[PDB]
CSV table of C-alpha atoms in Angstrom, one decimal:
chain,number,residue,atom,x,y,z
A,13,UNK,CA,-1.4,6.0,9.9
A,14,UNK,CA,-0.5,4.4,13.1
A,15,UNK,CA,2.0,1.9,13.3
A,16,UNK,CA,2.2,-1.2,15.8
A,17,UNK,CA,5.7,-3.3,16.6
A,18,UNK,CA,5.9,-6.0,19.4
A,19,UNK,CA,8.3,-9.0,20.2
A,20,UNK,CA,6.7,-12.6,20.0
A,21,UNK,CA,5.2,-13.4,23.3
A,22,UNK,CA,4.2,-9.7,24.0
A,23,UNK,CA,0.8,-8.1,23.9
A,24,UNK,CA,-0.3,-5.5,21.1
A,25,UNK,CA,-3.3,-3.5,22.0
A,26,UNK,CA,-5.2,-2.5,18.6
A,27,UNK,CA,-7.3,1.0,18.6
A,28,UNK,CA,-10.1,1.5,16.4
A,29,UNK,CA,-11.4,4.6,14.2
A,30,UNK,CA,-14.6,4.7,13.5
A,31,UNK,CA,-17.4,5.7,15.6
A,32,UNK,CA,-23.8,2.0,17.3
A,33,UNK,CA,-24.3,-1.6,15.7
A,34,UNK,CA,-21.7,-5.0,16.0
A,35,UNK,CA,-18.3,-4.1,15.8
A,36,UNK,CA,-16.5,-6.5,13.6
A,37,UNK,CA,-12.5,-6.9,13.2
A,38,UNK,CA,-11.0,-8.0,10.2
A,39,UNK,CA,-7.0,-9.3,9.6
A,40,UNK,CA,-5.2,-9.1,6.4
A,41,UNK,CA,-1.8,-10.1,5.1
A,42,UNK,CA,-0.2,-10.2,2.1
A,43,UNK,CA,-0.9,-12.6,-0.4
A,44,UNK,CA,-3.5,-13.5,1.6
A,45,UNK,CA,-7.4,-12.6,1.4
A,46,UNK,CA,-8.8,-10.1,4.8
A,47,UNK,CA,-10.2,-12.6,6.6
A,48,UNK,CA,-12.6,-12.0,10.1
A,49,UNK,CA,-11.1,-12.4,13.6
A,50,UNK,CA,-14.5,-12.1,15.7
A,51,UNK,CA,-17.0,-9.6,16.3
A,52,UNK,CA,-18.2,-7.7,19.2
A,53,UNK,CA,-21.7,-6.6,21.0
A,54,UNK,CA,-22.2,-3.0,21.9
A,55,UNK,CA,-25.3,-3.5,24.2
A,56,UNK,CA,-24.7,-7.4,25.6
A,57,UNK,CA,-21.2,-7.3,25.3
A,58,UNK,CA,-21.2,-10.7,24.3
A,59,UNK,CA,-18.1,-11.3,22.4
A,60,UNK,CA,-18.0,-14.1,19.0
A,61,UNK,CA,-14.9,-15.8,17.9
A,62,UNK,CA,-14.5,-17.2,14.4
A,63,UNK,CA,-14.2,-21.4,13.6
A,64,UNK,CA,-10.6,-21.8,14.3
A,65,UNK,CA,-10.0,-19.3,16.6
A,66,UNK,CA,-8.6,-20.1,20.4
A,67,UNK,CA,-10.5,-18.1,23.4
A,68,UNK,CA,-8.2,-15.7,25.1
A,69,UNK,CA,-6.3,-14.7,22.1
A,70,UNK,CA,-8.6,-11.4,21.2
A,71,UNK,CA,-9.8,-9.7,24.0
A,72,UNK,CA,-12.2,-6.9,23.1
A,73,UNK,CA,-13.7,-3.9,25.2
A,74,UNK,CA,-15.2,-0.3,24.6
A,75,UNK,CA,-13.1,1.2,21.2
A,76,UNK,CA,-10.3,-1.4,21.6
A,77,UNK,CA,-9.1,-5.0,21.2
A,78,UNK,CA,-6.0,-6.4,22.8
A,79,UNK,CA,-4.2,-9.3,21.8
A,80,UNK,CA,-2.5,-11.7,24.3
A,81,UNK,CA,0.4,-14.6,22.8
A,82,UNK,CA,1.7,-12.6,19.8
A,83,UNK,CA,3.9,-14.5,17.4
A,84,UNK,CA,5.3,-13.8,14.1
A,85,UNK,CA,2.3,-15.2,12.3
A,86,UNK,CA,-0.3,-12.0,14.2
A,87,UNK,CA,1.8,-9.9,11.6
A,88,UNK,CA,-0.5,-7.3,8.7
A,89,UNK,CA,-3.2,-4.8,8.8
A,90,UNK,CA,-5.7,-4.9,11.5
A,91,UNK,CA,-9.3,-3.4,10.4
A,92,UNK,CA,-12.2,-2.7,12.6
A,93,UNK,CA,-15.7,-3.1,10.8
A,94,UNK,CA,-19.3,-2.1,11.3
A,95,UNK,CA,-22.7,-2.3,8.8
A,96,UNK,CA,-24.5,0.6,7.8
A,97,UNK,CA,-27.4,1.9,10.1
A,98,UNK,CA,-29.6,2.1,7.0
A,99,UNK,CA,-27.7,1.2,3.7
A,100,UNK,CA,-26.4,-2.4,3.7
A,101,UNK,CA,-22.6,-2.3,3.5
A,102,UNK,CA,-19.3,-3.1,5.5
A,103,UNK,CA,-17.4,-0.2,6.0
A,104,UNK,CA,-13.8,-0.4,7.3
A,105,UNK,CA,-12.1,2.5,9.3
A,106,UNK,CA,-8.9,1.1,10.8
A,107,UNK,CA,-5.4,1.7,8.7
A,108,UNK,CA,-3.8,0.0,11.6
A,109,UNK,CA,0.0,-2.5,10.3
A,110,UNK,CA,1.1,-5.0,13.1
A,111,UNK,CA,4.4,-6.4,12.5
A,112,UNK,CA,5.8,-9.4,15.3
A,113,UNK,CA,9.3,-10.7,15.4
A,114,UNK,CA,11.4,-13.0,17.7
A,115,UNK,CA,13.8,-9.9,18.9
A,116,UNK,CA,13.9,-6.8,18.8
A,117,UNK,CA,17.3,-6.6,17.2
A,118,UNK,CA,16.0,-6.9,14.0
A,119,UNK,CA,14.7,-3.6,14.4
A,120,UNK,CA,16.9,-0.7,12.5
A,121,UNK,CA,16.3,3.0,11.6
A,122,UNK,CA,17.0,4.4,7.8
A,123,UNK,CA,19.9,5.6,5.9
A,124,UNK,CA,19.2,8.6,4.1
A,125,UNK,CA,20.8,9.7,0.7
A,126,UNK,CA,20.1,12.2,-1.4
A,127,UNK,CA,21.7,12.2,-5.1
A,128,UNK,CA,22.0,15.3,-7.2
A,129,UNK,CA,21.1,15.6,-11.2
A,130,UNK,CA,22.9,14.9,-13.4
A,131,UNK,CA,24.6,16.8,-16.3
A,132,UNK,CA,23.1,14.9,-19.1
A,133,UNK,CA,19.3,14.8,-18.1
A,134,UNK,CA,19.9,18.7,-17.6
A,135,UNK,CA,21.2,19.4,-21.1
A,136,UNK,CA,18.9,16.6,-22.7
A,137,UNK,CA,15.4,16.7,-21.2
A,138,UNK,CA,16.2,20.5,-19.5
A,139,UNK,CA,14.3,18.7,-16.7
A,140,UNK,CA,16.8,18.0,-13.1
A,141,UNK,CA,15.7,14.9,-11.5
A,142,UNK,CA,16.7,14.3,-7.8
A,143,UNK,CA,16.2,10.9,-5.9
A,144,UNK,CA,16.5,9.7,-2.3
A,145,UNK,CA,16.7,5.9,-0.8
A,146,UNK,CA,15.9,4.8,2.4
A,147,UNK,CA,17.9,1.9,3.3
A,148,UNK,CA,18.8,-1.0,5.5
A,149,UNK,CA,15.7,-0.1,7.7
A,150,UNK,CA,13.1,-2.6,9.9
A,151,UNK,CA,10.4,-2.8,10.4
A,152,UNK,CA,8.5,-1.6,7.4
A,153,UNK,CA,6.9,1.6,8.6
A,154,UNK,CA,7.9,4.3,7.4
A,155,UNK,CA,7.1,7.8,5.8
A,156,UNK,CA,9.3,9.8,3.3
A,157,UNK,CA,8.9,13.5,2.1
A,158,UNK,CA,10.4,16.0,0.5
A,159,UNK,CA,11.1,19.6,1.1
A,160,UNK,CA,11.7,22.6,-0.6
A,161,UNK,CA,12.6,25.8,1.1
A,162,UNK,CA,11.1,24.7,4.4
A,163,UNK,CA,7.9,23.7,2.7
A,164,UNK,CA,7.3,19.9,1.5
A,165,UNK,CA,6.0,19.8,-2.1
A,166,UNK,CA,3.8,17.3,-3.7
A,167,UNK,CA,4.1,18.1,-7.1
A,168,UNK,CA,6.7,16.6,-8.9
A,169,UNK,CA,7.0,13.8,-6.7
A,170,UNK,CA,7.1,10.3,-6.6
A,171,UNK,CA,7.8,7.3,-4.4
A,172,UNK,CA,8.0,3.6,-4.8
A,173,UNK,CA,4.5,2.1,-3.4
A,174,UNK,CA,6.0,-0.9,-2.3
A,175,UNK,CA,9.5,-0.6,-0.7
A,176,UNK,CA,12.2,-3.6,-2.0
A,177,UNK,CA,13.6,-5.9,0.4
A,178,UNK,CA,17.7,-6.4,0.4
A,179,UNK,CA,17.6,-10.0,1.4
A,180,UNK,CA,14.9,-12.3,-0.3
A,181,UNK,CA,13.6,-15.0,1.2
A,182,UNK,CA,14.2,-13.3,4.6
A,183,UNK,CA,11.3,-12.7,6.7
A,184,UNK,CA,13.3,-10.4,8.9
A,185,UNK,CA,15.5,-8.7,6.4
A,186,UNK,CA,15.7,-5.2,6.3
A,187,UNK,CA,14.3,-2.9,3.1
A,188,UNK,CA,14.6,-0.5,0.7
A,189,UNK,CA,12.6,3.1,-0.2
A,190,UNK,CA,13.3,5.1,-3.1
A,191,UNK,CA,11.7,8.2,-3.8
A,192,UNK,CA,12.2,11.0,-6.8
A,193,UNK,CA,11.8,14.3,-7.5
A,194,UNK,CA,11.7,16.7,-11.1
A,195,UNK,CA,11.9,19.8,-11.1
A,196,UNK,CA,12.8,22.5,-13.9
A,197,UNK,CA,16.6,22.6,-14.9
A,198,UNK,CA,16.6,26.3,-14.2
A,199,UNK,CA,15.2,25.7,-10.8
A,200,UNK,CA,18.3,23.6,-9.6
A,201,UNK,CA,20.3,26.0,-11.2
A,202,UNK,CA,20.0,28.2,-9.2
A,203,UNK,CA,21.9,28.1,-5.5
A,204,UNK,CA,19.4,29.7,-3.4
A,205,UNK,CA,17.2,26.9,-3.6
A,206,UNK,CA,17.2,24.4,-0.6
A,207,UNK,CA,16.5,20.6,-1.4
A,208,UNK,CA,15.5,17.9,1.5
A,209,UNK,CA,14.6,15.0,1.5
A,210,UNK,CA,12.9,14.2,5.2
A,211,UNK,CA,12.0,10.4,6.0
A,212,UNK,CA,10.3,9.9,9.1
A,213,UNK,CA,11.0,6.3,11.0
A,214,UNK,CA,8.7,4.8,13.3
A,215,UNK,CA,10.7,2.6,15.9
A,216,UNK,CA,10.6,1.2,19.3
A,217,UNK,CA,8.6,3.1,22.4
A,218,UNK,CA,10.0,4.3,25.8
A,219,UNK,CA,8.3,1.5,27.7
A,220,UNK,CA,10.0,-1.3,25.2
A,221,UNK,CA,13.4,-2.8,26.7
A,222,UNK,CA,16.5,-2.6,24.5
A,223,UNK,CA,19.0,-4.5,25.9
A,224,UNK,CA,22.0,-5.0,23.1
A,225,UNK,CA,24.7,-2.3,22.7
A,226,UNK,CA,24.3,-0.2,19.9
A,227,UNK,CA,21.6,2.6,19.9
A,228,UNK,CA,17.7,2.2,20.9
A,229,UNK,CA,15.7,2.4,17.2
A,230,UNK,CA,13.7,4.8,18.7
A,231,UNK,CA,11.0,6.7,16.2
A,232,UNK,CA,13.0,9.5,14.5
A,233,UNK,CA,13.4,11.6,11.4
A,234,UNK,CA,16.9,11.1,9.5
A,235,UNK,CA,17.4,13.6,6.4
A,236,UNK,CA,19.3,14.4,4.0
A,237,UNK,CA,20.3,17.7,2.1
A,238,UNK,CA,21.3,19.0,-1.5
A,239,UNK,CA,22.0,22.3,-2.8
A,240,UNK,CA,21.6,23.8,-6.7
A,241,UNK,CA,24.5,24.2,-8.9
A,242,UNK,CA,24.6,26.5,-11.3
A,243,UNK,CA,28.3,25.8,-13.3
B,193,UNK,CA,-10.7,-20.0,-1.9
B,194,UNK,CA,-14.2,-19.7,-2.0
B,195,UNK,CA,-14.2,-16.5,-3.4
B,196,UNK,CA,-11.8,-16.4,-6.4
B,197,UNK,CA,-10.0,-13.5,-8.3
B,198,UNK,CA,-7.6,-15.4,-10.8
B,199,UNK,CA,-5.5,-11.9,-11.9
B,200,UNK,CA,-3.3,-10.9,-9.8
B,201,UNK,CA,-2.0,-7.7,-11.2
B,202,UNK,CA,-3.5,-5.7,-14.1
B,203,UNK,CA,-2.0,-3.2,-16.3
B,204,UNK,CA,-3.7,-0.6,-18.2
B,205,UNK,CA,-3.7,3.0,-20.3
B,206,UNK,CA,-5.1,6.5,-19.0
B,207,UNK,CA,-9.0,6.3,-20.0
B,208,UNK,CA,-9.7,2.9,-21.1
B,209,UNK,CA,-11.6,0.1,-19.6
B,210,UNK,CA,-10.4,-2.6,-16.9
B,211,UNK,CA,-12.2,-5.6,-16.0
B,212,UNK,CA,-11.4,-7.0,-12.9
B,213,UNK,CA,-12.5,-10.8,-12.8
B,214,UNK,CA,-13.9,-12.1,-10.2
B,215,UNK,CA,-15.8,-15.5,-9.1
B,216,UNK,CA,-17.5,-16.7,-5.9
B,217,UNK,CA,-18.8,-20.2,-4.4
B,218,UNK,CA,-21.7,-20.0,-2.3
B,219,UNK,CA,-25.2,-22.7,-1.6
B,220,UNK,CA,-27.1,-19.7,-0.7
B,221,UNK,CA,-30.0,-18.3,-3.1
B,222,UNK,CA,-29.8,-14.7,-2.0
B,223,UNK,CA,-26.9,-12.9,-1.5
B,224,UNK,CA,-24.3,-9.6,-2.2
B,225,UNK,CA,-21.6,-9.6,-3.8
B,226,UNK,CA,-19.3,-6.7,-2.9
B,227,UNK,CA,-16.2,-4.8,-4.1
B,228,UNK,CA,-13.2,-2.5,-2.6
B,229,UNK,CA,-10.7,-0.2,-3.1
B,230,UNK,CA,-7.1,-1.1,-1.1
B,231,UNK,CA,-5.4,2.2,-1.2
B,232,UNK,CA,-1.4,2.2,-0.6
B,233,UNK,CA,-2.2,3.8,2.9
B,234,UNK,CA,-4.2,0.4,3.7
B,235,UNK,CA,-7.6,2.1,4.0
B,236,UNK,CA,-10.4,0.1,2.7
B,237,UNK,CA,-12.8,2.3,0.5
B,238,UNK,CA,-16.5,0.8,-0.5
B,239,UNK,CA,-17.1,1.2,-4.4
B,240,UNK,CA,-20.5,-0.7,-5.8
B,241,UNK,CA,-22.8,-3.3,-4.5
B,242,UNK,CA,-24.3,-6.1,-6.5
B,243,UNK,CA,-27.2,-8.3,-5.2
B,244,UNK,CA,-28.6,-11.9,-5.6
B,245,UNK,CA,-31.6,-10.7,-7.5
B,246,UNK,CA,-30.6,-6.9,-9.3
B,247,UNK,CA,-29.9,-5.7,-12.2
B,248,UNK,CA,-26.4,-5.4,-13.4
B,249,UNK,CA,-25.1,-2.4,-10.9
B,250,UNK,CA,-23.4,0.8,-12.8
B,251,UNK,CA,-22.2,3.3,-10.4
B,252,UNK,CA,-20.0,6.4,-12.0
B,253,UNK,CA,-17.3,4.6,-13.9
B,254,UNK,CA,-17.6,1.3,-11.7
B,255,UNK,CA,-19.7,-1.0,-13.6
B,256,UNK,CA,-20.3,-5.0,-12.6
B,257,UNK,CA,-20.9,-7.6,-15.3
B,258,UNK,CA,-23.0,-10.0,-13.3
B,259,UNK,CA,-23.8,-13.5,-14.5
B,260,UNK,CA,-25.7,-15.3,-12.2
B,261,UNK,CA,-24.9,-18.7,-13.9
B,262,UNK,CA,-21.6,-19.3,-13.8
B,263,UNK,CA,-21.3,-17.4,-10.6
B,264,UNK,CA,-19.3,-14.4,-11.9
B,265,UNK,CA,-19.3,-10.8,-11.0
B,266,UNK,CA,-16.5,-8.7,-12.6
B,267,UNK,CA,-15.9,-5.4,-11.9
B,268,UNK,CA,-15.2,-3.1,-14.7
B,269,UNK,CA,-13.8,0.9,-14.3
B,270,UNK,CA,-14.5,2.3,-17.8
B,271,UNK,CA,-12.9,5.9,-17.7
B,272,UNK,CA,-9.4,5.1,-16.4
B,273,UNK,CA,-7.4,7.5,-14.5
B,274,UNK,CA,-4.1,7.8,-12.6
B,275,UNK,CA,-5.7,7.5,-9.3
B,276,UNK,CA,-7.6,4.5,-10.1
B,277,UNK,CA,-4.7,2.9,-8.9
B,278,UNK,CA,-4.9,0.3,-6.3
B,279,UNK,CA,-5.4,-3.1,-5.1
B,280,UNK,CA,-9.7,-4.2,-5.7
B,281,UNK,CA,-11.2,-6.9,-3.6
B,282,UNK,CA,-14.1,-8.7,-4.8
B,283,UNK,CA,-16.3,-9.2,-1.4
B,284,UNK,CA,-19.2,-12.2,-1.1
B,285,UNK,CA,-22.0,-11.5,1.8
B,286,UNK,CA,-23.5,-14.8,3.0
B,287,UNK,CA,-26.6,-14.1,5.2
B,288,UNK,CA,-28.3,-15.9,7.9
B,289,UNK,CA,-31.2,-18.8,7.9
B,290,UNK,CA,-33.5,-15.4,9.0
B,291,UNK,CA,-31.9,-12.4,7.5
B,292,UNK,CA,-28.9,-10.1,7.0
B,293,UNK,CA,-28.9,-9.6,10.7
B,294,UNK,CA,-25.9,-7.2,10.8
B,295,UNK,CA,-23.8,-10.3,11.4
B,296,UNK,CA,-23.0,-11.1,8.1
B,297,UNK,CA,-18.8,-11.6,7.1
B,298,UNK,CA,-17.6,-10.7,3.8
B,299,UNK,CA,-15.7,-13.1,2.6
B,300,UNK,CA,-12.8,-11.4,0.5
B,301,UNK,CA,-10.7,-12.3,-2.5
B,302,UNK,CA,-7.1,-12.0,-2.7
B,303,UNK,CA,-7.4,-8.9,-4.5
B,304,UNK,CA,-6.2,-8.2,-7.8
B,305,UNK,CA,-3.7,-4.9,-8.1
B,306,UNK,CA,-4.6,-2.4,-11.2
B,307,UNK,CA,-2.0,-0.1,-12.5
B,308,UNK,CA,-3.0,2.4,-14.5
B,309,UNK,CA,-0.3,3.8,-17.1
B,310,UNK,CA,0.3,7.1,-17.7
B,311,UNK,CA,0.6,8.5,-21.2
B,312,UNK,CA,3.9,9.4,-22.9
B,313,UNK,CA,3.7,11.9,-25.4
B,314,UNK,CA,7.3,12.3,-26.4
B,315,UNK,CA,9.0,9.9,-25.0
B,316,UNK,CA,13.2,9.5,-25.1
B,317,UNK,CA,14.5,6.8,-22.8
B,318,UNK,CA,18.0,7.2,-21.0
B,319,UNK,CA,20.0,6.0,-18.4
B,320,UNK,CA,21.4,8.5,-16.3
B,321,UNK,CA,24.3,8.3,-13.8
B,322,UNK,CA,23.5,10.2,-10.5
B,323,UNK,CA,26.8,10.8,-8.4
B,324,UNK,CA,26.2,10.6,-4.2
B,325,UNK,CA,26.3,13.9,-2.5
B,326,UNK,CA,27.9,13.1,0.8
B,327,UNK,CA,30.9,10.9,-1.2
B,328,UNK,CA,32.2,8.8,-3.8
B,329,UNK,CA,22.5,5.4,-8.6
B,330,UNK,CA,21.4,4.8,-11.6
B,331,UNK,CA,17.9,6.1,-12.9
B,332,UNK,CA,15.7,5.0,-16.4
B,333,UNK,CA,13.3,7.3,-16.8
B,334,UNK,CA,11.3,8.9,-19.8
B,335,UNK,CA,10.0,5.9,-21.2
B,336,UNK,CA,7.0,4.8,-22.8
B,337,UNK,CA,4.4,2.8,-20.5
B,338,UNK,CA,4.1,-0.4,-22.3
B,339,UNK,CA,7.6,-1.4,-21.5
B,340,UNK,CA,8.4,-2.9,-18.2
B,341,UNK,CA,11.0,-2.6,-15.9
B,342,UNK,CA,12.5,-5.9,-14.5
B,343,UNK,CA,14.5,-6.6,-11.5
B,344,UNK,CA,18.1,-7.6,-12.4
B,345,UNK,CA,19.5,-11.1,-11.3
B,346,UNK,CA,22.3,-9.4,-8.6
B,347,UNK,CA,21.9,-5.8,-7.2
B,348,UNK,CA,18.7,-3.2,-6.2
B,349,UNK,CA,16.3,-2.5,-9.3
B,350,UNK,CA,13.2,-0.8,-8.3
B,351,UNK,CA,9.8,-0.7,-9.8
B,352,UNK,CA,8.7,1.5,-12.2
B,353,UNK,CA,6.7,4.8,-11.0
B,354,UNK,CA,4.8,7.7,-12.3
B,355,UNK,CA,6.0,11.3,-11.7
B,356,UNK,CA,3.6,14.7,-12.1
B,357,UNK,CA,4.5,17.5,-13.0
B,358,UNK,CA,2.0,20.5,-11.9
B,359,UNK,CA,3.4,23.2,-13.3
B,360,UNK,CA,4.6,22.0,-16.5
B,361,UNK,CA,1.6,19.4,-17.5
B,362,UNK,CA,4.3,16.8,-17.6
B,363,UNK,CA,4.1,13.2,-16.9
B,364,UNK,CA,7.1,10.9,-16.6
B,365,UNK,CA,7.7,6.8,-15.5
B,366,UNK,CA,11.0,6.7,-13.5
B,367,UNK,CA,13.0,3.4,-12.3
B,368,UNK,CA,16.5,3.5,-10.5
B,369,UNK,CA,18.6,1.0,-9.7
B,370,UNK,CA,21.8,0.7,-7.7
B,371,UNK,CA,24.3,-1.6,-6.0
B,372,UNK,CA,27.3,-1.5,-3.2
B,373,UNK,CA,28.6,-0.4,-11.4
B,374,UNK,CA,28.1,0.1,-14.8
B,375,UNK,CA,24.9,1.6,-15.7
B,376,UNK,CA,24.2,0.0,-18.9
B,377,UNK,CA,24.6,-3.5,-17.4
B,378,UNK,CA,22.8,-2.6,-14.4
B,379,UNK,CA,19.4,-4.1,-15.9
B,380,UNK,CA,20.0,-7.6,-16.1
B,381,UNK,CA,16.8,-7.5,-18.8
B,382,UNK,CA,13.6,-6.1,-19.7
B,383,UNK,CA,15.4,-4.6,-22.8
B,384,UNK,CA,13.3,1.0,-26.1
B,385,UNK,CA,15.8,0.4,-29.1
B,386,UNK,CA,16.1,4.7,-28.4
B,387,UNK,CA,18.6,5.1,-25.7
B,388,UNK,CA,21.5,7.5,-24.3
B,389,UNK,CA,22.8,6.0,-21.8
């Protein structure tokens, strides 16, 4: 889904998916219940701010809302809402994640590492079982996948849901991905057969400013590669 | 909280029930009470609607145990399945003096996470040591569902997760752990008395 990071201070403007009636915008975070921000008018335009809530801090136009004096607290998932034309639900369309920090140098790309079978779970299970971790990478946004041959493959598959963190009780620590793959002992036997394990980063845009030394966490895609071993 | 979900996570086997408990506070005398589906890609999916005055609301394997009384409605998925996995959020519509006027906020729990557990048929759990690639982890996997895998004091122990296989018709629960190493005192605790490492 799309993936949203700004400095405190900044401005983060919010897109919305679905496509007639009150447009409503929700925020959740975790631990914490989805709460509503403010709805909007499609015909008046008339725009209605929750109890709590400071003018100015939402602004909202045809469709897409732009928020104004971001701090670390504006962080989690951003959904836009709307009520059914003739059945009486909520239905939410936006899979938007908004993550805020201080600077920008907490921002770091992922190390890739792919780890090859070992000799035991080959002649025990008959089963070859690769896995690849992500690590030392902020924000949270990212995607892993693997690849076979030039093709990614599903089956077989799995990733952690929830990616660990390396420092706890850290809000701006970097984390941790791990991801795993089985496949038949025969089939990483054999040489021929390519494994990669791709993960795709989401960074920092062309129009952000990096001004420290080392290299600009762009978005980019670092891999990693194994081969099969038959002896 | 006015709306109120006391579990936090849930654990339970392939096809069997789940009841997910939840409880609301509201002065109104009509209302809806609502509940969603929090996928791991953070898209909110609508599942079954329960009113002030209805019956108890069955839809497919979602089925709500309303009592009206002590202000409970708990969500209940009878036929469980791998990807009945996810986060649930009990939902309360409060209307207006006039009506539902399309204004209305749901007012949302804090969710309560459902993991479904995948069946082992022939299970033998081992600890394997995987040796880096590029130069220079350790992985417990093939274990039954009902044990647990626990993060280590430190040290990097990931959660437990459930691999497919297609072709095969094989399911597996993996967990690897690693740190900058013994792989037998790698997990700090959460114990099979069947193991190779």
């Amino acid at each position: 889904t799309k993936s949203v990071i700004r400095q405190t201070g900044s401005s983060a403007e919010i897109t919305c998916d679905l496509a007639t009636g009150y447009i409503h915008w929700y925020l959740h975070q975790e631990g914490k219940a989805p709460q509503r921000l403010l709805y909007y008018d499609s015909y008046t335009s008339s725009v209605v701010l929750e109890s709590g809530i400071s003018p100015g801090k939402y602004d909202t136009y045809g469709l897409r809302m732009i928020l104004r004096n971001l701090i670390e607290n504006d962080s989690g998932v951003y959904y836009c809402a709307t009520w059914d034309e003739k059945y009486y639900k909520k239905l939410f369309g936006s899979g938007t994640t908004l993550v805020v920090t201080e600077d920008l140098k907490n921002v770091f790309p992922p190390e890739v590492a792919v780890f090859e079978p070992s000799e035991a779970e080959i002649s025990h299970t008959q089963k070859a079982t690769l896995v690849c971790l992500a690590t030392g990478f902020y924000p949270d946004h990212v995607e892993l996948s693997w690849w076979v041959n030039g093709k990614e493959v599903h089956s077989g598959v799995c990733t952690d849901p929830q990616p660990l963190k390396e420092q706890p009780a850290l809000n701006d620590s970097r984390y941790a991905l791990s991801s795993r793959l089985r496949v038949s002992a025969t089939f990483w036997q054999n040489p021929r057969n390519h494994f990669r394990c791709q993960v795709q980063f989401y960074g920092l845009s062309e129009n952000d400013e990096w001004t420290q030394d080392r290299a600009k966490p762009v978005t980019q895609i670092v891999s990693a590669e194994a081969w099969g071993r038959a002896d | 909280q006015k709306v109120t979900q006391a579990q936090s996570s849930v654990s339970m086997p392939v096809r069997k029930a789940v009841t997910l408990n939840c409880l609301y506070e509201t002065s109104w005398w009509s209302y809806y009470i609502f509940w969603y589906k929090q996928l791991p890609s953070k898209e909110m999916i609508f599942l079954i609607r329960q009113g002030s005055d209805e019956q108890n609301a069955k839809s497919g394997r979602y089925s709500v145990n309303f009592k009206k009384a002590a202000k409970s409605v708990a969500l209940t998925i009878s036929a469980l399945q791998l990807e009945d996995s996810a986060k649930y959020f009990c939902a309360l519509g409060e209307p207006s003096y006039w009506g539902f006027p399309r204004t209305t906020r749901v007012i949302f729990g804090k969710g309560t996470r459902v993991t479904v557990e995948p069946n082992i048929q022939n299970p033998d759990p081992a600890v394997y040591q995987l040796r880096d690639s590029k130069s220079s982890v350790c992985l417990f996997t093939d274990f039954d569902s009902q044990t647990n895998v626990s993060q280590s004091k430190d040290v990097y122990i990931t959660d437990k997760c459930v691999l497919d296989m297609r072709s095969m018709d094989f399911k597996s629960n993996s967990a690897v752990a690693w740190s900058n190493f013994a792989c037998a005192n790698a997990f700090n605790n959460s114990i099979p008395e069947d193991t190779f490492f």
